Design an enzyme around this catalytic site. Sequence first.
Site, PDB file in Angstrom:
ATOM      1  N   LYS A  62      25.602 116.523  80.669  1.00  0.00           N
ATOM      2  CA  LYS A  62      26.682 115.733  80.061  1.00  0.00           C
ATOM      3  C   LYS A  62      26.670 115.685  78.526  1.00  0.00           C
ATOM      4  O   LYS A  62      27.726 115.555  77.909  1.00  0.00           O
ATOM      5  CB  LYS A  62      26.727 114.324  80.628  1.00  0.00           C
ATOM      6  CG  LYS A  62      25.569 113.420  80.311  1.00  0.00           C
ATOM      7  CD  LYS A  62      25.873 112.075  80.952  1.00  0.00           C
ATOM      8  CE  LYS A  62      25.026 110.943  80.452  1.00  0.00           C
ATOM      9  NZ  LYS A  62      25.562 109.618  80.863  1.00  0.00           N
ATOM     10  N   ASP A  63      25.504 115.860  77.917  1.00  0.00           N
ATOM     11  CA  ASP A  63      25.396 115.896  76.458  1.00  0.00           C
ATOM     12  C   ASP A  63      25.906 117.202  75.818  1.00  0.00           C
ATOM     13  O   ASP A  63      26.324 117.194  74.655  1.00  0.00           O
ATOM     14  CB  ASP A  63      23.960 115.617  76.029  1.00  0.00           C
ATOM     15  CG  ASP A  63      23.561 114.166  76.259  1.00  0.00           C
ATOM     16  OD1 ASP A  63      24.402 113.300  76.076  1.00  0.00           O
ATOM     17  OD2 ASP A  63      22.389 113.910  76.618  1.00  0.00           O
ATOM     18  N   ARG A 113      33.728 105.411  78.870  1.00  0.00           N
ATOM     19  CA  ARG A 113      34.024 105.788  80.251  1.00  0.00           C
ATOM     20  C   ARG A 113      33.665 104.689  81.181  1.00  0.00           C
ATOM     21  O   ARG A 113      34.436 104.363  82.083  1.00  0.00           O
ATOM     22  CB  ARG A 113      33.219 107.040  80.620  1.00  0.00           C
ATOM     23  CG  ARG A 113      33.283 107.438  82.095  1.00  0.00           C
ATOM     24  CD  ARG A 113      32.388 108.604  82.346  1.00  0.00           C
ATOM     25  NE  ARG A 113      30.982 108.252  82.145  1.00  0.00           N
ATOM     26  CZ  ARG A 113      30.212 107.625  83.031  1.00  0.00           C
ATOM     27  NH1 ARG A 113      30.704 107.248  84.202  1.00  0.00           N
ATOM     28  NH2 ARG A 113      28.941 107.374  82.752  1.00  0.00           N
ATOM     29  N   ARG A 114      32.470 104.145  80.988  1.00  0.00           N
ATOM     30  CA  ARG A 114      31.972 103.058  81.808  1.00  0.00           C
ATOM     31  C   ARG A 114      32.707 101.808  81.493  1.00  0.00           C
ATOM     32  O   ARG A 114      33.209 101.196  82.408  1.00  0.00           O
ATOM     33  CB  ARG A 114      30.507 102.834  81.555  1.00  0.00           C
ATOM     34  CG  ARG A 114      29.641 103.961  82.042  1.00  0.00           C
ATOM     35  CD  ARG A 114      28.190 103.630  81.778  1.00  0.00           C
ATOM     36  NE  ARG A 114      27.303 104.632  82.375  1.00  0.00           N
ATOM     37  CZ  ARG A 114      26.350 105.313  81.748  1.00  0.00           C
ATOM     38  NH1 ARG A 114      26.098 105.093  80.460  1.00  0.00           N
ATOM     39  NH2 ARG A 114      25.628 106.208  82.405  1.00  0.00           N
ATOM     40  N   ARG A 131      22.790  98.965  72.040  1.00  0.00           N
ATOM     41  CA  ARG A 131      22.282 100.090  71.277  1.00  0.00           C
ATOM     42  C   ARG A 131      20.769 100.251  71.446  1.00  0.00           C
ATOM     43  O   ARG A 131      20.036  99.268  71.542  1.00  0.00           O
ATOM     44  CB  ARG A 131      22.643  99.868  69.805  1.00  0.00           C
ATOM     45  CG  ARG A 131      24.142  99.556  69.572  1.00  0.00           C
ATOM     46  CD  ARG A 131      24.458  98.991  68.176  1.00  0.00           C
ATOM     47  NE  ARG A 131      23.524  97.948  67.696  1.00  0.00           N
ATOM     48  CZ  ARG A 131      23.547  96.652  68.028  1.00  0.00           C
ATOM     49  NH1 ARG A 131      24.465  96.187  68.874  1.00  0.00           N
ATOM     50  NH2 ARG A 131      22.639  95.816  67.531  1.00  0.00           N
ATOM     51  N   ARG A 137      16.871  99.133  75.357  1.00  0.00           N
ATOM     52  CA  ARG A 137      17.903  98.453  76.141  1.00  0.00           C
ATOM     53  C   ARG A 137      17.304  97.516  77.189  1.00  0.00           C
ATOM     54  O   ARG A 137      17.794  96.416  77.380  1.00  0.00           O
ATOM     55  CB  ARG A 137      18.839  99.489  76.797  1.00  0.00           C
ATOM     56  CG  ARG A 137      19.866 100.070  75.828  1.00  0.00           C
ATOM     57  CD  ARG A 137      20.736 101.128  76.447  1.00  0.00           C
ATOM     58  NE  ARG A 137      21.265 101.997  75.391  1.00  0.00           N
ATOM     59  CZ  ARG A 137      22.535 102.370  75.215  1.00  0.00           C
ATOM     60  NH1 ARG A 137      23.489 101.961  76.058  1.00  0.00           N
ATOM     61  NH2 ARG A 137      22.864 103.154  74.196  1.00  0.00           N
ATOM     62  N   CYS A 225      31.712 114.587  75.602  1.00  0.00           N
ATOM     63  CA  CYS A 225      30.756 113.556  76.020  1.00  0.00           C
ATOM     64  C   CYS A 225      31.313 112.144  75.832  1.00  0.00           C
ATOM     65  O   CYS A 225      31.375 111.377  76.797  1.00  0.00           O
ATOM     66  CB  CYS A 225      29.417 113.720  75.304  1.00  0.00           C
ATOM     67  SG  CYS A 225      28.328 112.260  75.411  1.00  0.00           S
TER      68      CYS A 225
HETATM   69  C1  DPM Z   1      27.619 112.141  77.035  1.00  0.00           C
HETATM   70  C2  DPM Z   1      26.832 110.874  77.125  1.00  0.00           C
HETATM   71  N1  DPM Z   1      25.492 110.874  76.963  1.00  0.00           N
HETATM   72  C3  DPM Z   1      25.012 109.612  77.131  1.00  0.00           C
HETATM   73  C4  DPM Z   1      23.542 109.322  77.079  1.00  0.00           C
HETATM   74  C5  DPM Z   1      22.745 109.949  78.185  1.00  0.00           C
HETATM   75  N2  DPM Z   1      22.277 111.233  78.073  1.00  0.00           N
HETATM   76  C6  DPM Z   1      21.484 111.514  79.156  1.00  0.00           C
HETATM   77  C7  DPM Z   1      21.439 110.412  79.987  1.00  0.00           C
HETATM   78  C8  DPM Z   1      20.610 110.276  81.240  1.00  0.00           C
HETATM   79  C9  DPM Z   1      21.317 110.790  82.484  1.00  0.00           C
HETATM   80  C10 DPM Z   1      21.562 112.275  82.480  1.00  0.00           C
HETATM   81  O1  DPM Z   1      20.685 113.090  82.254  1.00  0.00           O
HETATM   82  O2  DPM Z   1      22.794 112.616  82.778  1.00  0.00           O
HETATM   83  C11 DPM Z   1      22.299 109.417  79.373  1.00  0.00           C
HETATM   84  C12 DPM Z   1      22.860 108.192  80.050  1.00  0.00           C
HETATM   85  C13 DPM Z   1      22.187 106.869  79.819  1.00  0.00           C
HETATM   86  O3  DPM Z   1      21.575 106.276  80.691  1.00  0.00           O
HETATM   87  O4  DPM Z   1      22.407 106.401  78.623  1.00  0.00           O
HETATM   88  C14 DPM Z   1      26.087 108.773  77.395  1.00  0.00           C
HETATM   89  C15 DPM Z   1      26.102 107.309  77.729  1.00  0.00           C
HETATM   90  C16 DPM Z   1      26.290 106.443  76.511  1.00  0.00           C
HETATM   91  C17 DPM Z   1      25.165 105.466  76.339  1.00  0.00           C
HETATM   92  O5  DPM Z   1      25.263 104.272  76.579  1.00  0.00           O
HETATM   93  O6  DPM Z   1      24.055 106.052  75.949  1.00  0.00           O
HETATM   94  C18 DPM Z   1      27.232 109.572  77.377  1.00  0.00           C
HETATM   95  C19 DPM Z   1      28.639 109.064  77.561  1.00  0.00           C
HETATM   96  C20 DPM Z   1      29.023 108.780  78.990  1.00  0.00           C
HETATM   97  O7  DPM Z   1      28.068 109.002  79.823  1.00  0.00           O
HETATM   98  O8  DPM Z   1      30.111 108.339  79.325  1.00  0.00           O
END
Ligand code: DPM
Length: 317
Positions: A62-63, A113-114, A131, A137, A225
């Site tokens: 997703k990143d 999104r959430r 944050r 968190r 993302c």
């Molecule tokens: C694109 C996007 N990345 C993140 C942060 C993130 N990156 C990896 C994970 C763990 C799960 C995985 O490998 O898919 C995470 C998710 C997490 O628990 O934070 C986000 C979320 C934003 C945040 O609050 O960090 C996003 C945007 C989205 O998911 O909508």
Amino acid sequence: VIRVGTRKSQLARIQTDSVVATLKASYPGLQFEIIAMSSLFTKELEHALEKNEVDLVVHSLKDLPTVLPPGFTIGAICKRENPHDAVVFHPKFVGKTLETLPEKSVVGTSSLRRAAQLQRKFPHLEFRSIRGNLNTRLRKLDEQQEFSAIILATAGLQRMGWHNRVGQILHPEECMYAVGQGALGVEVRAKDQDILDLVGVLHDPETLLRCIAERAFLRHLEGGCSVPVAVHTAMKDGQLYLTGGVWSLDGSDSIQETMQATIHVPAQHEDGPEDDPQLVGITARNIPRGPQLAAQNLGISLANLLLSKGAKNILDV
Ligand SMILES: *Cc1[nH]c(Cc2[nH]cc(CCC(=O)O)c2CC(=O)O)c(CCC(=O)O)c1CC(=O)O
């Protein structure tokens, strides 16, 4: 030697080690050196790759963007961990769901999104921005007086070993996941066939196909993302089901549709040619191309339907 570059962060490190442990099981007679460096971070890992300082980088799917920069590609889409979003609750909430949480209760999330989905579904809940990293968190929830709960990824909590903190796993009717969530992606140099060949083993066909469909859908929508685009995928009885949704920032406006395609998860591998363009940033030359193309087509079809229903209005706030 196999030089794997990683971020110094704890979640980046664990994901990196997991991929390395698989490559080690496939290639026990090869050396693996780990280099730790510390989208600001994506960039320096990609500069090392450019210099040939490292050969692989392990990221969360997703990143990554839908179009990787020139000279890089996603050589492997690993097996998928739980893709769902989970809720961790404040200790004082003895067995609650977001449903039973008192009204005006704050819920920490920095994802649009959430927040967009959860605001629409749980209109009597306040969603403020939280944050930091999982450990930060989680500490903020436990210590401070602000958040009643926090929304996080099940895959992420699982990898840290903290599945004991998951209070509720959210279903697609509540909050659909991000594109490629719960899936690790291996970035590599696009012209290094020897490194792409090795990483080919890490490709999981069921996850690869679902992840192409989802990335194709997002790329077509002009998403990324940090955009309120969500999806749910499945593969059952030779069918790829793709549900995709688009929301306004407050969830007020939302289009959601489902499509399916007859796509068979291929058991066997192949020796495809180097001239085959990478699909949605992914190089799966050792996986049948028929099923991949079909997955992208399905994603495009769903994006096109959503755009016909004015999905570009909702997104362009
Ligand atoms: C694109 C996007 N990345 C993140 C942060 C993130 N990156 C990896 C994970 C763990 C799960 C995985 O490998 O898919 C995470 C998710 C997490 O628990 O934070 C986000 C979320 C934003 C945040 O609050 O960090 C996003 C945007 C989205 O998911 O909508």
